[PDB]
Design a binder for this molecule. Structure first.
Ligand SMILES: CC(=O)N[C@H]1/C(=N/OC(=O)Nc2ccccc2)O[C@H](CO)[C@H](O)[C@@H]1O
Ligand SMILES: CC(=O)N[C@H]1/C(=N/OC(=O)Nc2ccccc2)O[C@H](CO)[C@H](O)[C@@H]1O
Lengths: 585, 585
C-alpha cells in the first residue's frame, strides 16, 4: 500500500517484483538525500533526489526490513552507468537488455549504455552490421523506452573514427572508399561524413540526446590512404563529427586516450592504487571529465569480479578526490564476447554501493535481495581465473581461456602452467560451482557453464605435458591411455561445454556471432583428434619421431616473467590456438 | 653407354631414372647451342652451354627418340628458376625438395628457390621459426647440395623488412623491440641489423652467394614505432642490408614494388597482354632487372595451370622484347598453403618450353616423359576453378575455396554461385578426376584430393540456398531431408577430404602448419552441425524464426560485379567462413 507514486512508478515496482516486496510507504521527491528511508512500525517515508533512485531505495527498503529503519544516502556521482559491449560478437537480445535494466535499476544506476561499433542499422548502409545482428532502431527505441520506465537514461556508445573492423572489411566500393588504414575511417572524406550523418540520423530517432562518439585507439589516423591523398587532423575530424551531432541535437562524450563542446572519458581498468589514478586525473583535467572503470568480462569465458572489486575501491577514492561527477562501468567482450553477459553482476553492485555509500558495507545484503544469492557465492563464477599463487592486484591473468584453446600436440602456453597447484584448483572449483549452480536459480546457467569449464581445465591443464613426458620416456602404456581414453573423453567434455555455452549464449544474446565460437571449438576438437591420430601412428610403428613433441617449449610471453607465479595473460584466440598463420595472407 | 660424362653427371642420370633411358651419347660442353642433339642410328652427340642443361637435353633426347634426331635450342633466359613458398604454413620437406629438384632439372630450370620469411633457424633467435618447422642449416645445405648434383643453383628468398608476421607476433621484449608496425621491422634500430646479420650468417653457411632480400609490400614503413621515435628511409635501410650482405659475400636481388648493387625483380602474375607487361618494363628499367611470373597455386586447395599458361605466353613475349635475362616462376601459398606443392608441374614445364623454344610445341611430349602423364590430363587438376562461364583471362576466381569454407546457415558468398551451371561441373569433374587419379601414378594423391573436393562442391554449392528456399516455402519434407541426411553426409565427405588432404600434406610438407587446416576444417564441420541442430529446433516447434535465414544475402564483393558470370575472388579464410569477428580484439 504505497503513496505518492505515479502510474509509471507503480508499473515499474510491478515489473520489479527480482524483488519480494513485503508496509506503507510515503514517497516524495526530496532534495533531502539521494535516498532517505525513515520510519518504523510498518509505516515509512522514502524520498529520492532523482526519480530512478526510487528503485535502489526500494531494494534497500526491502533489505533493511528483515521495523525501525533510518537510512540516508548521498551518492558521489550525478550519473552512474553500465556499458554493455554489443560489438565483439555478442549482441544482447532485447529480453536480456530488459532484465539487465531492471537489475541496474535496483542497484542505483541512472544510465544504461550499449557499445555498438557497427551493430546498429543505418538506412542505405546495408553492409553496416551485415549478419552482425545489428540493432534495429525499433529494438533501440524498445530498449530505451524500457529503461525510461525506470527513469533510466540510454546513451549509445558508437564509433566515428576507429574500431570499425567488421564494417570496413566488406570489399564493395562504397565501403572501401571510406577507409584510411586498418579499422580507421577516411577523415576529410565526404562519403565518411555522410555515413556519420546516417549514424546520428539513426540515433536521432531515440529520445536520448547523449552519445559517446568513441574515437579511442586510432594509432595510425591519417597514415595510410590519408597520407596517400593529402595530425590537429583529429580536431578537424572531431569538430566535423560535433557539427554533425549538434545538427541532430546530441551532446557528445568520447574516450580520452588520443588526446569544450565534448566530455572526455578517462578510461582505466588497471591501477591498484589511488595514487596512479590521481596522477592521470591531474594530466586529464589539464585538457570536463567522466571516469570509465571496468567490470572485467573480456578475458575469455570467465569474468574477474574479484579483481574488479579491488580496482573499484581505489578508483572510487580517486574519483571522489577529483570530484568526478560521472562514472561509467564498462563490460567489454574482447575477441569473441565469450564471457556471459550476466557474469559481472557483483562488479555492478560494487560500483553502486561505492557511489551511494563510499563503502561495501551492505553489498552482500543488497546483492542477495536483487539476485537471490550471496555475493560470495556469485563471485565464485571467477574460479577458473583465480589461481592460488596469483596476487589479486595484477590484471588480465586468464588461464580460463588459454588453458582451454591451447593445442595438445603443440602446447605453446605449457610454460605458464603449474599443474600440481592448477589441477586441484580446477577440480574442486568445478565442485564448488555445481553446488552454487543448484541455488543460483535463473542465473544457474552461468555457473553450470563454469563448472564444466573447470572440469575440462583440471584434465587439460597438463595433458600436453604428460604427452611430452610419456613420449621422451617411451611409455607405451601412458601414450596409449591418453590417446584411446583421455583425449576422446576431453572431446566429450568439450562437446558438453559447447552445448552449455550455446544455451548461455542464446539466452543472453542473438544468434549472430555464435558462429565464431562454433568454429573455434570445432577446431580445438579437431586438433584433439589429431593428437589421438598422431600418437596412434607412432604407436603402430609407422612413425619415427612425433615431430611436434621434439620442439622445446618456450615461454609464450614475457609480460609477467619477472613474477613468482607461472601464469600470464593471453587473450587472442588465434595466437593461443596455433603458432602458425591463420589470419595473414 | 654414354661418353664424356663426369662422376657427378653419371650419378645424376642415375637418380633421374622420372625418366626411362632407352643408345650411345657423345656428351660435350659446347657454346654451339643451349642444347644440341644431333645423330641417328643409335649414336648421338648431345651438347650443352650450361651443365644443368644436360638434364633437359636428356629428357628431349628420350622424348624425340620414339632414330634420326636433330635438335638445337637457344634459351631466351640465362637463368630460369622456380620459387616455392615455405612461409604460408606449408614447409616442403627434404624428400619432396629433392623430387622437386629432379623434376626442375628435367625441365631445364637452372635455379631452385625457397621463400622463407621466418622458416629458417637463426642462432640466438629461438622465436624465429618457433613451431613453424623452420629449416635447419643442415636441411638447407642438404637441399642445396642435392641441387648442386644437377648443377642447379639454390637462391634463398627471405625477408629483411616486411612479411614477418609470424615472427613479430611473439610477445617477448627481444622481438617486440624489433618492430615498427604490423609485419614491418624497425628500420634504423640496431637490434634489427643484428637479426639481419644472423640471417646472412645462417645463409652464409651454404655455398650460394645469391639472395633475394624481399622488401616487397611494406605500405606503412616508418609510420608506427618509427614515427614515434624518429621515406629515402628505404634506401637507408637497403644500403645497410646490402652492407651486411656484402660482409658475407652475397649478391642481392629484391622485389621491385616499393620503388646498382642490387637486381630489382618486377613481379606480375596478372596481365593478359604483351602491351601491359611492356609498359611496366618501360617504367621499371627507368630505375638491372629479372621477371617473376606466376604458377598459380595460392588460391585455396586447387591450382590454376590454365590461367598460368595464358599469362606465361604473353609475359614470355614481353620478357624477350625487353631482353630480360632472368625469369623467376613463383609458387605462392597465400593464407594456409592449402594447394598441393606438386599441383603446378604443368606451369613449370610451360615456362621451360617458352624459355628453350619460344613455344609450346613439345609441351605434352616432354611433360609426359617427365611425369608419366599427358599435360591435358594433369591440368584437369584445375577443374574446381574452371567454371564454364568464366573467361580464361580474369585471375584469382577461386570457387574451389570459397564454396568449400562458406557457412551453411549464413552463406555470404551465395550471390556468387550459379548452381545449374556449377553443380554439374563439379560432379563430372569429380568423375574426370577419379579417372586421371588411376593413371597418375605417384601423383595420384594430387587428383584423389581434387576428386573428393569436386564431389563435395557439387552438393555444397547450393545447400545454403536450398535451405533458404525450403524455409520461406515452409517445406518440412526438404528441411528435414537436408538436416537428417544431406548435412550429415556433407560432414562425412568433408571428413574424407580432410583425410586425403592430410596425406597429401604430409607427403609434401612437414607436419607444422597442418594445424591451421585442422582448425579451419574442424570449424566448418561444427557450423554444419549447427545448421542441422538449428533446423531440428525449428522443426520441433521450439523456434519462431530461424533468424540467420531471415537475412538477405548481399554480394560478397564487387570486384567482378560488372562481368557476365556470378563468381568472384575471395581468398581469406576468415572472411569466407564468417561475417563475425574472429581475429580482431
Ligand atoms: C576505450 C576502451 O577501453 N577501448 C578498448 C580498451 N583498450 O584497452 C587497452 O588498450 N589497454 C591497454 C593496452 C596496453 C597497455 C596498457 C593498457 O580495453 C577494453 C578491454 O580490453 C577494450 O577492448 C576496449 O574496446
Ligand atoms: C612479391 C610478391 O608477389 N608478394 C606477394 C604478392 N602480392 O601480390 C599483390 O599484392 N597483388 C595485387 C594486389 C592488389 C592489386 C593488384 C595486385 O602476391 C603473391 C600471391 O598473391 C603473394 O601473396 C606474395 O607473397
Amino acid at each position: 500500500r504505497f503513496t505518492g507514486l505515479s502510474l509509471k512508478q507503480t508499473q515499474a515496482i510491478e515489473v520489479l517484483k527480482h524483488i519480494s516486496l513485503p508496509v506503507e510507504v510515503a514517497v516524495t521527491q526530496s532534495d533531502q538525500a539521494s535516498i532517505s528511508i525513515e520510519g518504523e512500525e510498518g509505516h515509512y517515508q522514502l524520498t529520492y533526489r532523482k526519480p530512478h533512485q526510487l528503485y535502489r531505495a526500494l531494494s534497500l527498503l526491502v533489505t533493511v526490513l528483515a521495523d525501525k529503519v533510518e537510512i540516508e544516502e548521498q551518492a558521489a556521482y550525478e550519473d552512474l552507468a553500465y556499458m554493455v559491449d554489443c560489438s565483439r560478437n555478442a549482441v544482447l537480445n532485447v529480453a536480456s537488455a530488459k532484465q539487465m535494466i531492471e537489475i541496474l535499476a535496483l542497484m542505483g544506476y541512472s544510465t544504461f549504455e550499449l557499445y555498438m561499433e557497427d551493430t546498429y542499422q543505418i538506412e542505405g548502409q546495408p553492409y553496416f552490421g551485415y549478419f552482425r545482428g545489428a540493432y534495429s532502431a525499433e529494438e533501440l527505441q524498445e530498449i530505451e523506452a524500457y529503461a525510461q520506465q525506470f527513469d533510466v537514461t540510454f546513451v549509445p556508445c558508437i564509433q566515428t573514427l576507429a574500431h570499425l573492423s567488421a564494417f570496413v572489411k566488406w570489399g564493395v566500393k562504397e565501403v572501401q572508399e571510406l577507409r584510411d588504414v586498418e579499422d580507421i575511417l577516411l577523415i576529410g572524406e565526404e562519403k565518411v561524413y555522410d555515413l556519420i550523418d546516417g549514424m546520428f540520423a539513426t540515433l536521432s530517432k531515440l529520445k536520448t540526446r547523449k552519445v559517446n562518439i568513441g574515437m579511442d585507439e586510432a594509432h595510425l589516423v591519417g597514415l595510410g590512404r590519408y597520407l596517400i591523398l593529402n595530425r590537429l587532423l583529429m580536431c578537424q575530424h572531431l569538430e566535423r563529427v560535433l557539427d554533425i551531432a549538434d545538427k541532430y541535437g546530441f551532446h557528445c562524450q568520447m574516450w580520452s586516450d588520443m588526446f569544450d563542446r565534448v566530455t572526455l572519458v578517462y578510461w582505466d581498468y588497471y591501477q591498484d592504487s589511488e595514487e596512479k589514478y590521481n596522477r592521470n586525473f591531474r594530466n586529464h583535467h589539464k585538457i570536463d571529465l567522466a571516469f570509465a572503470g571496468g567490470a572485467w568480462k573480456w578475458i575469455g569465458f570467465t569474468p574477474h569480479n574479484h579483481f574488479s572489486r579491488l580496482v573499484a575501491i581505489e578508483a572510487n577514492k580517486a574519483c571522489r578526490a577529483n570530484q568526478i561527477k560521472e562514472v561509467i562501468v564498462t563490460g567489454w567482450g574482447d575477441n569473441g564476447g565469450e564471457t556471459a553477459q550476466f557474469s559481472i553482476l557483483p562488479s555492478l553492485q560494487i560500483w553502486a554501493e561505492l557511489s551511494y555509500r563510499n563503502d561495501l558495507d551492505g553489498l552482500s545484503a543488497h546483492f542477495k535481495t536483487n539476485t537471490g544469492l550471496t555475493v560470495e557465492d556469485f563471485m565464485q563464477i571467477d574460479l577458473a581465473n583465480l589461481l592460488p599463487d596469483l596476487p589479486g592486484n595484477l590484471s588480465g591473468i586468464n588461464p580460463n581461456r588459454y588453458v582451454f584453446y591451447q593445442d595438445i600436440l603443440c602446447p605453446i602456453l605449457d610454460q605458464h602452467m603449474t599443474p600440481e597447484q592448477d589441477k586441484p584448483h580446477f577440480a574442486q572449483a568445478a565442485e564448488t560451482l555445481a553446488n552454487i549452480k543448484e541455488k543460483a536459480g535463473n542465473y544457474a546457467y552461468l555457473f553450470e557453464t563454469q563448472a564444466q569449464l573447470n572440469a575440462i581445465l583440471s584434465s587439460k591443464v597438463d595433458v600436453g605435458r604428460r604427452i611430452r613426458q610419456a613420449y621422451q620416456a617411451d611409455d607405451k602404456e601412458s601414450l596409449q591411455q591418453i590417446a584411446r581414453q583421455e583425449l576422446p573423453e576431453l572431446r566429450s567434455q568439450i562437446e558438453d561445454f559447447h552445448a552449455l555455452f550455446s544455451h548461455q549464449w542464446l539466452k543472453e544474446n542473438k544468434v549472430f556471432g555464435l558462429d565464431t565460437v562454433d568454429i573455434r571449438m570445432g577446431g580445438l576438437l579437431q586438433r584433439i583428434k589429431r593428437a589421438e591420430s598422431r600418437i596412434e601412428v607412432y604407436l603402430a610403428g609407422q612413425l619415427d619421431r612425433i615431430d611436434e613433441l621434439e620442439v622445446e617449449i618456450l615461454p609464450f610471453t614475457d609480460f609477467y616473467a619477472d613474477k613468482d607465479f607461472a601464469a600470464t595473460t593471453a587473450n587472442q584466440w588465434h595466437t593461443i590456438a596455433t603458432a602458425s598463420t591463420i589470419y595473414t595472407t
